[PDB]
Every structure is written in structure tokens, then in C-alpha cells.
Amino acid sequence: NSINDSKILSLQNKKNALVDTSGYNAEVRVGDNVQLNTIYTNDFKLSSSGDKIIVNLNNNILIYENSSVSFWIKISKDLTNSHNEYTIINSIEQNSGWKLCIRNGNIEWILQDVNRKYKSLIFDYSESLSHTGYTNKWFFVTITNNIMGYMKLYINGELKQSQKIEDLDEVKLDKTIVFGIDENIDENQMLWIRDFNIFSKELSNEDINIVYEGQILRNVIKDYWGNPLKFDTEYYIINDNYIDRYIAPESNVLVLVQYPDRSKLYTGNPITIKSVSDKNPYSRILNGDNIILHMLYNSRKYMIIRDTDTIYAQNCVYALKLQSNLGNYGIGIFSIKNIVSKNKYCSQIFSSFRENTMLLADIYKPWRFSFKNAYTPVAVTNYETKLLSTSSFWKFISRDPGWVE
């Protein structure tokens, strides 16, 4: 309400064109090579040869003023793992204005006056390409400014930095905003931005979380990178407690096998998700949807099913197995639900076959004619006290163009 009312620029894909739907009619010129609406309706990709977007504002409503800028961004590995500084959004016409820069795993917002003097807010999104970092992951950015002279930086609704801006003087805002990288770049160096908005007020933490919660699309399951999960797409599924292990069948019992090369992310047996009630090929998976899992193992497709008999040693614990006969079988139907978290894109997996179970990974003796131990994904009953266990969190890693190897 009050939030939407203060929007003076809102870049959205309407026809098959990126336009300003704030009502203020800014002119938006998109380069011919720029790809729009590839992951999210209102996203655009900056990868192509010097491709860019120019926004010429047609108003004069808007440093010592109240304003906010928000958008989501996803930066590829090759671009984050570079020592060069890249300007991606620029308002600086002459010497004053603002700009967003990328450099060595850090994202930086700069506000400078005519004398080349500047102040900034910085955030290390890529620890060191760490699993816990945001390299090639969608994350929400928000920058606010107030007449008090403070500019703040929020990431996924969390305040990261605050800065007093009295050191600077003459800072006039340009009527032009240019998206794009001017520096020469390589093939796999790319980034995506979605839902770029500018507000004529300083959004409060409450306001920001409302924007964040509304644009993350809570009912759409997410893959590891933050893209919406899709049917008929291959995924490497990993458990949050064993990020260095991939799912694999031993003696028709799925177990978590350690990666041969700990740096190679795409390791294992790809799993494709199928919809029980057929829809459209690669359509989005919503929470509560019934799904079936197919694993590609040695060039053959198998359906993952829950074992009917419990493993000896809550109450019941069942191992997962593979079945060559594909089709709709209750024992192979699962349900997925996103986990609420600002640090990860994970989900929990449930089965309501004969008893309500939730998938978890832990140490067990899954076999019948053996006492061998193994880290194994299991479907367990009475999981009420397990809802917060990280051992119940699963990540779906897809082959993403922003992470090549």
C-alpha cells in the first residue's frame, strides 16, 4: 500500500518488453542482445557483448532526500572469481550520482559528488566461493537514503551497513540509469537482475521484509541457486548436512557417497522430477505438489521409492530404493515444501504413503544381510521434533549457466 504508492520506477516485463510500470513513464531502451524473462518474469541478463539497458527518467520527484532502491541480483562464478572491478549500474553522468560495482566477491554501492569525493556501502556476497556464500545465487538488495544523512544497505531484508553522508556535498541525481558492463569480459562472465524498483521514501526494515517476502514467491520451490524448481529438469540432490556427498544406489539402497573431487559441484546421478498430475513440460513446482523422482543411473531411468519394510534400528525408519517400472505408484509419490530461510534455498521432502514420513539423512544399517553402516537418506515417522533439523534439508543443484565446470 504505502510501499507501492511510493514507487517511482518499476522495471517489469509486460508484453515481451521491459517497461516502466510505475505510471511515471520512464523511457526504457533495451539492447537487442539482452535476454529478458528467462528465469523470473521481470529479470534480464547482462552477459552478451556490451549489452545494456538505458533508462531515461521522465520526472523530477527525486543526497539528503528520502528514497530507496531494491532489486535481486545473481552473479556468475567466473564474474565473482575475478580481481577486476566491474560497474554494472551507473547514474554518474559527469562526476556526481551513484553506481553499483562488483569486485572480487564484493558488491559495492557508491554515491559521489562532483569533486570525485565518494562514500560507500560494501557487502561480501562471495565469502570465497564458499558453499555458504551467495556466488551465482539470487539475493535481495535494498539501499535506502534519508534526510538524516544516512544510507543503509540491506541484504535479504537484513541490515548489513549504515553510512553517514555529510562528508560529501553537491550530489545531483542524473535522469539516466545505465545497466551493463563496459569492461571487456569473457564468455561465462554474466549476471542477472530482477524486479528493479526505486521508491520516493526511505523504506523501513518492516517495509523491506514485506517487499522481500512478496518477491521471493513463497509458494514456488527453489533450486540451489534460487531459481524456481522445475519438472523434467535434472538436479543433483544433496542433503544440507553432507554437502560433500552425492546420492547413489549401493545394493538397491540409496546412500550418500563422498565426492571424488571436492571442488566439482556437478557430481553424481542426476534426478528428474515428474508431476503426478501431468501439466506442462518444464513448469514450476509449487509447494504441496505431488512429485515423482526419477534417477538416471548408468544410462538407465529408475523411479525412487520408499521401502515397504522398516529398517531394524520416533518409531519407523524406511530406506529408499530404486524401481525400474515407471508409473504412478503411491510408494513413489512425494511432496516438497520450501524451508523458510534467508541464508539458503532448501526444501523438506515428505511422503504420505502408508504413514506420514519426512526424508532425512543420517547413519544407519540400511541393509538386511549386512551390518555395514552408511550415511543414508531415510523416510522417518513422528518427525515433529525433526522439522528444524538440518538433516532434513535438501538442495536441488541444477546445471546453471552461471556456474560452469
Query: Alpha-carbon distance 69 to 201, whole Å?
Result: 10
Residue 208 near residue 155, CB atoms below 8 Å: no
All structural domains of the chain with their residue ranges: 1-223, 224-405
Residue 370 near residue 364, CB atoms below 8 Å: no
Residue 332 near residue 292, CB atoms below 8 Å: yes
- The DSSP call for residue 99 is E
Question: Which positions make up the binding site?
Answer: 308-309, 321, 368
Query: Alpha-carbon distance 282 to 233, whole Å?
Result: 7
Residue-wise DSSP of 29-57: EE-TT-EESSSSTTEEEE-STT--EEEE-
Handedness of CA 264, 349, 366, 250 (dihedral sign): negative
Residue 151 near residue 119, CB atoms below 8 Å: yes
Query: Quick one: which H or E segment has residue 377?
Result: strand 374-380
Nearest-10 Cα torsion for 207, 144, 181, 118: -170
Beta pairing partners, 340: none
Question: Which positions make up the binding site for N-acetyl-beta-neuraminate?
Answer: 308-309, 321, 368
Region of residue 310 (phi > 0: left; psi between -120 and 50: alpha; otherwise: beta): beta
Exposure string over 321-331, b if 16+ CB within 10 A, otherwise e? bbeeeeeeeeb
Q: What's the chain's Rg over C-alpha atoms?
A: 24
CATH class of 1-223: mainly beta
Amino acid at 298: N
Select from 107, 47, 96 the least CA-distant residue to 71: 107
- Exposed, middle or buried: residue 284 (CB in 10 Å: 0-12, 13-18, 19+)? middle
**How far is C-alpha 313 from the geometric centre of its chain's CA atoms?**
38
Hey, which CATH number is domain 224-405, 2.80.10.50, 1.10.1040.10, 2.60.40.420, 2.60.120.10? 2.80.10.50
Per the listing, cell 554501492 goes with 109
CB under 8 A, 24+ apart: contacts of 340-344: 342/156, 342/157, 342/158, 343/132, 343/156, 344/240, 344/393, 344/395
Select from 97, 135, 144, 141 the least CA-distant residue to 118: 97
Angle at 293 between CA 290 and CA 295, to 5 degrees: 175
Per the listing, cell 523411479 goes with 303
Please name the residues in contact with 90: beta carbons below 8 A apart, sequence gap of 6 or more: 97, 99, 100, 177, 178
Residue 176 near residue 54, CB atoms below 8 Å: yes
| Solved with | X-ray
